[PDB]
């Protein structure tokens, strides 16, 4: 045995700040940057240290002293946050918690330069394409002023006052230099502006929507919440959700509803479709799904577990950890139609939560089929029809039980189809927790490991690592076969407290980073670096790959008449894809099905549920101008929005009928 895992580096920081912020610069940079800072929660932060490595975590160099007020200030610098550039991974900016002072770098932190600035950098926002460009916001200013810098933060100009929030636009839907803002109004509410010239000209400033509560920007979509007084002052206000797709003017979305809607939360926005959580004034929250490219919302799932500081869960522990509403709702990343939600039955505690899953973007929902056998091999008695299934914990479930270290469901585009989650088998989420794994995008699970663990993967999903939570340890569990079997590696001589287990975003490496502190002493930071190439041993070859689409799990059914096929390494293959693996993905249209069509405007389903066609609706009694070209008139059946279906017999007949121009 030449040990299958090397400990490429051991690093004691001699630092005991309660929080660490880490950034890998990536792009094969080999640079990692860390900030040790006091807890954010307090607004009284007292000290900070900054460390950077250049040999990919083999050894960290402390640079806190290089952050100073120039020659010579005995005042001691203290950093709140540091900001990186999406555009240039070499650049970095550090901001003093107190001093209206900034530090910048274009050399991965070798050389830092100090500057004072006309405001405190509470919050900065760096353009994602233009490295030189960024914005800076001073929340604590009475006027809540907003500033732009054009030279990566040396010189600033203040371009707006009374800002509630702001963001850059998005390529390519918005022009370059587009900035969105909510600006405060004397009513409770705010006005939403767009500007292409940094609010310099009035003709380049554009009103998007007036009197809004919140506003949000998300790819093709923009969302806002409006409180309208319909009956008048004396009457019930109505709360509405306004929506723009493709930057058309925002219009109010239509909701079919028993009850008064109290607030909205955008849970996910993808493929021209939107999941919104509508919560009512009774603390119930249901989940709607947008038509494709549309404002036509229909009910998808009821009683989703949800927190809002205004609303539900407000009066529990969660409030001490979340100051912004969210839901235990998960998008399985890199896939189109697969989501996992926590439902709530009674009051908020484990006993009342159950997990459900969808593969059709919320068309239908099922409970999660529990694994047949334990990790060890013994039969697990669990029957869906006895109300028994698999249930997976998510931040909210967890935050209620005050479990701040547990793992949210893990899924990433590095490994399409692979989910790892903390959960339980039973009637609900309230039993012993284990680690569960699927590579069928949720369709089937295995009990991978018995206890709570930290887990992560590398090499595009080909190797998984895990460390047992709760007590000190020096074991690193790992698996190369999607958790079917595990092997332990001792990562240090004496066991230590583990704070987390990570890989450079992208999960391409076979390197893992363990953060922790040793047992003997009270907390001090400590970082190990670990190379697990030899566990995979050899390069993969065409033999180790196989093709897979989610359709393969839901009986070949496409989604909006298209499907994605992925080249994935088989589960048993012991070999490594390689950091540069460039995973073949193919999207394609599939020949048409009945489910690709719906009933046309003013048509409906005949009473005989058994056999289902569209028939002219009686109550509507029932034309293109100008026609010179061919009309193709309806047979009562219409391809559903966004559905890219193509080919097949059912298309051949069920499609609309032509009539050559009038």
């Amino acid at each position: 045995q030449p040990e299958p895992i090397k400990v490429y580096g051991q690093v004691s920081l001699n630092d005991s700040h309660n929080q660490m912020v880490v950034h890998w610069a990536g792009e094969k940079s080999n640079v990692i940057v860390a900030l040790a800072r006091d807890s954010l929660a307090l607004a009284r932060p007292k000290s900070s240290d900054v460390y950077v490595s250049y040999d990919y975590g083999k050894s960290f160099k402390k640079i806190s002293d290089k952050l100073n007020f120039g020659l010579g200030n005995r005042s001691e610098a203290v950093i709140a946050q540091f900001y990186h550039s999406p555009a240039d991974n070499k650049r970095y900016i550090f901001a003093d918690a107190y001093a209206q002072y900034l530090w910048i770098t274009f050399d991965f932190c070798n050389t830092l330069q100090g500057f004072s600035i006309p405001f405190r950098a509470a919050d900065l926002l760096l353009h994602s394409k233009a490295s030189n460009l960024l914005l800076g916001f001073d929340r604590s200013h009475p006027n809540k002023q907003l500033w732009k810098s054009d030279d990566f933060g040396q010189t600033w100009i203040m371009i707006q006052e009374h800002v509630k929030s702001f963001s850059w636009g998005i390529d390519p839907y918005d022009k370059p230099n587009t900035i969105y803002i909510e600006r405060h109004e004397p009513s409770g509410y705010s006005t939403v502006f767009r500007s292409t010239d940094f609010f310099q000209s009035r003709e380049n400033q554009e009103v998007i929507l007036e009197e809004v509560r919140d506003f949000q920007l998300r790819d093709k979509y923009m969302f806002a919440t409006k409180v309208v007084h319909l009956l008048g002052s004396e009457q019930q206000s109505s709360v509405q959700l306004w929506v723009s797709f493709g930057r058309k003017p925002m219009r109010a979305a239509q909701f079919v509803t028993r009850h008064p809607i109290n607030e909205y939360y955008i849970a996910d926005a993808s493929e021209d479709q939107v999941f919104v959580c509508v919560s009512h004034s009774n603390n119930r929250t249901n989940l709607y799904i947008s038509e494709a490219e549309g404002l036509k919302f229909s009910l998808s799932l009821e009683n989703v577990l949800y927190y809002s500081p205004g609303g539900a869960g407000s009066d529990t522990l969660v409030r001490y950890f979340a100051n912004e509403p969210f839901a235990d709702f998960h998008r399985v990343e890199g896939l189109q139609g697969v989501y996992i939600a926590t439902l709530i039955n009674g009051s908020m505690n484990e006993e009342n939560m159950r997990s459900v899953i969808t593969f059709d973007k919320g068309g239908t929902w099922e409970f999660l089929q529990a694994p047949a056998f334990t990790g060890y091999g013994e039969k697990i008695n669990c029957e869906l029809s006895q109300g028994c299934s698999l249930h997976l914990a998510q931040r909210l479930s967890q935050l209620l039980n005050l479990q701040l270290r547990r793992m949210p469901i893990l899924s990433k585009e590095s490994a399409p189809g692979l989910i790892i989650a903390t959960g339980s088998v039973g009637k609900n989420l309230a039993s012993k927790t284990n680690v569960y794994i699927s590579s069928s995008a949720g369709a089937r699970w295995r009990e991978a490991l018995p206890g709570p663990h930290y887990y992560t993967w590398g090499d595009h999903g080909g190797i998984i690592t895990a460390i047992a939570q709760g007590m000190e340890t020096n074991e690193l569990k790992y698996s190369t076969n999607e958790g079917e079997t595990w092997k332990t590696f001792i990562f240090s001589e004496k066991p230590v407290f583990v704070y987390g287990l990570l890989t450079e975003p992208g999960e391409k490496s076979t390197v893992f980073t363990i953060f922790g502190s040793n047992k003997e002493n009270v907390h001090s930071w400590l970082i190990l670096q670990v190379n697990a190439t030899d566990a995979l041993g050899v390069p993969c070859t065409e033999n180790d790959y196989k093709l897979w689409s989610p359709s393969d799990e839901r009986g070949n059914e496409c989604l909006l008449g298209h499907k994605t096929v992925f080249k994935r390494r088989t589960p048993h293959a012991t070999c490594f894809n390689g950091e540069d693996f460039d995973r073949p993905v193919v999207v394609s249209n599939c020949s048409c099905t009945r489910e690709d069509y719906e009933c046309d405007f003013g048509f409906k389903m005949s009473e005989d549920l058994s056999l289902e066609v569209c028939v002219p609706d009686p109550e509507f009694s029932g034309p293109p101008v100008p026609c010179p070209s061919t009309y193709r008139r309806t047979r009562g059946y219409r391809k559903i929005s966004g559905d890219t279906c193509s080919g097949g017999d059912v298309e051949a007949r069920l499609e609309g009928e032509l009539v050559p121009c009038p």
Binding site: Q19, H23, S39, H84, M471, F497, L502
Partner: peptide, 11 residues
């Protein structure tokens, strides 16, 4: 394992 020390954030 201490409840309010040793917390980690990726950027």
């Amino acid at each position: 394992l201490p409840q309010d020390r040793g917390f980690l954030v990726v950027q």
